[PDB]
Design a protein around this nucleic acid. Structure first.
Ligand SMILES: Nc1nc(=O)n([C@@H]2CS[C@H](COP(=O)(O)OP(=O)(O)OP(=O)(O)O)O2)cc1F
Ligand SMILES: OC[C@H]1O[C@@](CO)(O[C@H]2O[C@H](CO)[C@@H](O)[C@H](O)[C@H]2O)[C@@H](O)[C@@H]1O
Ligand SMILES: [Ca+2]
Ligand SMILES: [N+]
Lengths: 415, 553
DNA sequence: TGCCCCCCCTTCGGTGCTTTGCACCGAAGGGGGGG
């Protein structure tokens, strides 16, 4: 006897019509078992071809987890679904979450299955389960309850969510709790033992409502230890023509970010037509120019701030040897954060797994810092990414992405 | 008494009305054979006659069955299809015999009058109206509306196909020991049961279908191999495609070559080594479908090589899940690649080919990677897993490529097979400037209006060159400047350009290009022993860059 | 002079940085195949 919250699509927008991609035998078997159990429990019901919508579905295993977990790629539906901030159901984002010494991420999406979904909106959740060798045509379903991975699920469930958290929040006023998609982010400045203890309390606190993929898992973050990667100029005692050419190139590029950078005095050193390996000494004027440029790169960029109404963009460069650099911004050359990753899973053997890890890491940081996930510019060929990325995806959400091919003419973020 | 097959709700697109297309003139031979078929549907109840209150109509025609003495009724619902809602097709792919496991007993059925045994939506039948001339338009004639799925309506395939699955669902769940491959009305059913039990379950299935109004005539009931299915022939231990007819015409039109290349592709799924590069190359061009094309010396040999492959009958084997999948790739030249998939040596599950040329400039390694990606996805579709790869590329070559390339790339678990021609990188760019090698500052520029330009260089030893160029572009002159420096330098050279364009191309170590010039640059790069390319910004007063920029500008 | 699905090869127009030329990619029309 729970009334359904009516949901609309953005005016002038149809529903998602995204084709189902092929699934490995292990993923189909998992889905067929998961859907058989969801159909018995009424969480999903079969449909036919008269429903013109469709969203891709597959399955993942979270880190250090041996059990499958259904994942629907609701990216297309989420972009077409009415923004609930206009409905005032938006979840505010706490600026103090990134400052906590520890942050645990709990998968609470399971609770969304208790809330029914608006009848008129269920047709938009249609998905199709394929079969190996196309033995059986696609078997289509749709959701009757709040589906995991849909941006409307946490929004509608928030009214129920806040009540469940009421007693724990009042007993622990210094703990930060943020809800994003199927995940709950819980941060504290406590000691790890006390922190993990409080997290266990919140779990059992949830089962108190549970009796009235699973919840037992949690992942630890430490945002207070997150660092950035600035643009750096090498320190040499002797410079070759080539070195100064690279430096002038890099500085000339960097001037789009720091408008005070000059290269006039350094360029004049390349006045002749010299061999690239010729060592040339720095003039008195060029010595001060370099030092002053280093000074400029030390201070922050002027007029760079986070605008809550603009999308986040993330660019990633493969630097080689397991090193990966990234920048996050809303306006070009106004980076809100720059970073570097190294020695991730896959390092020195698998580019795609490493990049998959990088995208997950950057998204997780964006959620903690701004409550948004960025749109990624990926340094990979579309076909290469689409063939493998699902083998390494371990998150319950999926960010937007596009594919780029930018030869590194200037090693700008990594020497 | 049959079980009524629940109707599928169907609607027209909002604000759109039924079709009104009338009928085009029909030959008497066709007008006659039609009325006989319409009356049969009236008897069986497939069509109702009352149509005076119906303002709609859709043209009708007919064509024969594939090598059959029976005409086929078709309705041109193209107009109704536009005004009909959109459906989500449930047919996601085509089964392949290499994905089948061996079975002790097998059967193949066909449902008689598939579309006409499924009840159409009550409210939608009015728009399926159609008129047939009684006698050459002498009298008004018999109008009809469909009571079942008609042919020509875009919703017929998906609706019948979805209904076919809802009918089979209870039989499969109550009989897990059986496998049923459903493709439209075609039906494959196999089990390892004793033949007697198999015939029993088969008849139980025939009865189940007849219980929902679906007949399985004995004329289409295949009981003995070789079973004809999906265009193949299924034997107990091996499978094969149905014979391929290659046109041997001595005068080739554009459409002839199209049909030829089409059958060669279809044959490539089991016949290994098929090539279509030179034959398809004859098709490139805005020629009419009827224009005659003379086969090139290369195209004639390529056709001859393919003929030799098709002379011998080839068969594939079936899938054993207990064994790993092997995929082996060989380079065929000119961006062509064939492969074989197998579990035991020399017993192929299937074969295939990759010859896609994507990108203006590429190399064999990128293409081998693309071939691997094709085979991987194909393997997941047919078996749901990735095969282990045997590739004609050394671990060292691949390591050098993927670790240095600026794009993320990867290949699943694989091993080297020494089967020339091997894939390799044809040149390597230095990471540091070369000591004692001449430094060429290259540059080029072209006039946007006259399309005239200049390319040239100046070196640290005083060597200089400027060459005039006609009908060119900025980008072309930049490549030309680099080309000149390569021609005029010794075996080791430092080259400084400001062309991001040229550097992006060259730094990816292409070995093939659609650009004659780039190919010439590649030929030079292969001859060098050390080559260091560096980029500098323009108009910054840099070394020879300011000097070379004035010369060619 | 129909409908639905898969595949390869060529062409063509839209898109975005290599920029006003060139590279990429998806749609479409040709062919093969299935019902
Ligand atoms: N060319 C075709 N156009 C079609 O619309 N169909 C459709 C989709 S599959 C369905 C089958 O028709 P029905 O069973 O009468 O036709 P059939 O020849 O496959 O079978 P049969 O004569 O009933 O045994 O017709 C098939 C064609 F080959
Ligand atoms: O890799 C992108 C690829 O995915 C598809 C289909 O799965 O679309 C999905 O990914 C897009 C890129 O982020 C999203 O914009 C879209 O919403 C999502 O369905 C393809 O459209 C695309 O080629
Ligand atoms: Ca039939
Ligand atoms: N120039």
């Amino acid at each position: 006897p729970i009334e359904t919250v009516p949901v609309k699509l953005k005016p002038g927008m149809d529903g998602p019509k995204v084709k189902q991609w092929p699934l490995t035998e292990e993923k189909i078997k998992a889905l067929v078992e998961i859907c058989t159990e969801m159909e018995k429990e009424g969480k999903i019901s079969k449909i036919g071809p008269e429903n013109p919508y469709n969203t891709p579905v597959f399955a993942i295993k979270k880190k250090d987890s041996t059990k499958w977990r259904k994942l629907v790629d609701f990216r297309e539906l989420n972009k077409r679904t009415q923004d609930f901030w206009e409905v005032q159901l938006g979840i505010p984002h706490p600026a103090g979450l990134k400052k906590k010494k520890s942050v645990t991420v709990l998968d609470v999406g399971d609770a969304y299955f208790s809330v029914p979904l608006d009848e008129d909106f269920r047709k938009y959740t249609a998905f199709t389960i394929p079969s190996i060798n196309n033995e059986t045509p696609g078997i289509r379903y749709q959701y009757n309850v709040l589906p995991q991975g849909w941006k409307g699920s946490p929004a509608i469930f928030q009214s129920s969510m806040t009540k469940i958290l009421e007693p724990f929040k009042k007993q622990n006023p210094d703990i930060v709790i943020y809800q994003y998609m199927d995940d709950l982010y819980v941060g504290s400045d406590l000691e790890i033992g006390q922190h993990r203890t409080k997290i266990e309390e919140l779990r059992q606190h949830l089962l108190r409502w549970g009796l009235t993929p699973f919840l037992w898992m949690g992942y630890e973050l430490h945002p207070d230890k997150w660092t950035v990667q600035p643009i750096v100029l090498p320190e040499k005692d002797s410079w070759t023509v080539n070195d100064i050419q690279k430096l002038v190139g890099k500085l000339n590029w960097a001037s789009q970010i720091y408008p005070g950078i000059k290269v006039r005095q350094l360029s004049k050193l390349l006045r002749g037509t010299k061999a690239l390996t010729e060592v040339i000494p720095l003039t008195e004027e060029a010595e001060l120019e370099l030092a002053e440029n280093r000074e400029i790169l030390k201070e922050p960029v002027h007029g760079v701030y986070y605008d809550p109404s603009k999308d986040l963009i993330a660019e990633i460069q493969k630097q080689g040897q397991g090193q990966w650099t990234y920048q996050i911004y809303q306006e070009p050359f106004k980076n809100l954060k720059t970073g570097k990753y190294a020695r991730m899973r896959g390092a020195h053997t698998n580019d795609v797994k490493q990049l998959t890890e990088a995208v997950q890491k950057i998204t997780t940081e964006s959620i903690v810092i701004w409550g948004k996930t960025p749109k990624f510019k990926l340094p990979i060929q579309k076909e290469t990414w689409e063939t493998w990325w699902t083998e390494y995806w371990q998150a319950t959400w999926i960010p937007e992405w596009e594919f780029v091919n930018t030869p590194p003419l200037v090693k700008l973020w990594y020497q | 008494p049959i079980s009524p097959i629940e109707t599928v709700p169907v609607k027209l697109k909002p604000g759109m009305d039924g079709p009104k297309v009338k009928q085009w003139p029909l030959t008497e031979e066709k007008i006659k054979a039609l009325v006989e078929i319409c009356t049969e549907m009236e008897k069986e109840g497939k069509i109702s006659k009352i149509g005076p209150e119906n303002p709609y109509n859709t043209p009708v025609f007919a064509i024969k069955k594939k090598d059959s003495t029976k005409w086929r009724k078709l309705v041109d619902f193209r107009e109704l299809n536009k005004r009909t809602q959109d459906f989500w097709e449930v047919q996601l792919g085509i089964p392949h015999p290499a994905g089948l496991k061996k079975k002790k007993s097998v059967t193949v059925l066909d449902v008689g009058d598939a579309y006409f045994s499924v009840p159409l939506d009550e409210d939608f039948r009015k728009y399926t109206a159609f008129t047939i001339p009684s006698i050459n338009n002498e009298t008004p004639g018999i109008r009809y509306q469909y009571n079942v799925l008609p042919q020509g309506w875009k919703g017929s395939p998906a609706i019948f196909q979805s209904s076919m699955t809802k009918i089979l669902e209870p039989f499969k769940k109550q009989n897990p020991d059986i496998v049923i491959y459903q493709y439209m009305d075609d039906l494959y059913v196999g089990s390892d049961l004793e033949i007697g039990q198999h015939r029993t379950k088969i008849e139980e299935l025939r009865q189940h279908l007849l219980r929902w109004g679906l007949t399985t005539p004995d004329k289409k009931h295949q009981k003995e191999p070789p079973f004809l299915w999906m265009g193949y022939e299924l034997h107990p231990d091996k499978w094969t495609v149905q014979p391929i007819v290659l046109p041997e015409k001595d005068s080739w039109t554009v459409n002839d070559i199209q049909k030829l290349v089409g059958k060669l592709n279809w044959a490539s799924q089991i016949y290994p080594g098929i090539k279509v590069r030179q034959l398809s190359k004859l098709l490139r061009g805005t020629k009419a479908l009827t224009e005659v094309i003379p086969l090139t010396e290369e195209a004639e040999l390529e056709l001859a090589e393919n003929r030799e492959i098709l002379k011998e009958p080839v068969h594939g084997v079936y899938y054993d899940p207990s064994k790993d999948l092997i995929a082996e790739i060989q380079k065929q030249g000119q961006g062509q690649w064939t492969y074989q998939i197998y579990q035991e040596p020399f017993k192929n599950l299937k074969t295939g080919k990759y010859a896609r040329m994507r990108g203006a400039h590429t190399n064999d390694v990128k293409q081998l990677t693309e071939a691997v990606q094709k085979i991987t996805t194909e393997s997941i579709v047919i078996w749901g897993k990735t095969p282990k790869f045997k590739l004609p590329i050394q671990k060292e070559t691949w390591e050098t490529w993927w670790t240095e390339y600026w794009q993320a790339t990867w290949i699943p678990e694989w091993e080297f097979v020494n089967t020339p021609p091997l894939v390799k990188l044809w040149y390597q760019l230095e990471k540091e400037p070369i000591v004692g090698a001449e430094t060429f500052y290259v540059d080029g520029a072209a006039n946007r209006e006259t399309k005239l330009g200049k390319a040239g260089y100046v070196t640290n030893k005083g060597r200089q060159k400027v060459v005039p160029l006609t009908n060119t572009t900025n980008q072309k002159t930049e490549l030309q400047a680099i080309y000149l420096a390569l021609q005029d330098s010794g075996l080791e050279v430092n080259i400084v350009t400001n062309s991001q364009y040229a550097l992006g191309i060259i730094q990816a170590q292409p070995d093939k290009s659609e650009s004659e010039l780039v190919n010439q640059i590649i030929e030079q790069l292969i001859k060098k022993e050390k080559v260091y390319l560096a980029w500098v910004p323009a108009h910054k007063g840099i070394g020879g860059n300011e000097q070379v920029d004035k010369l060619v500008s």
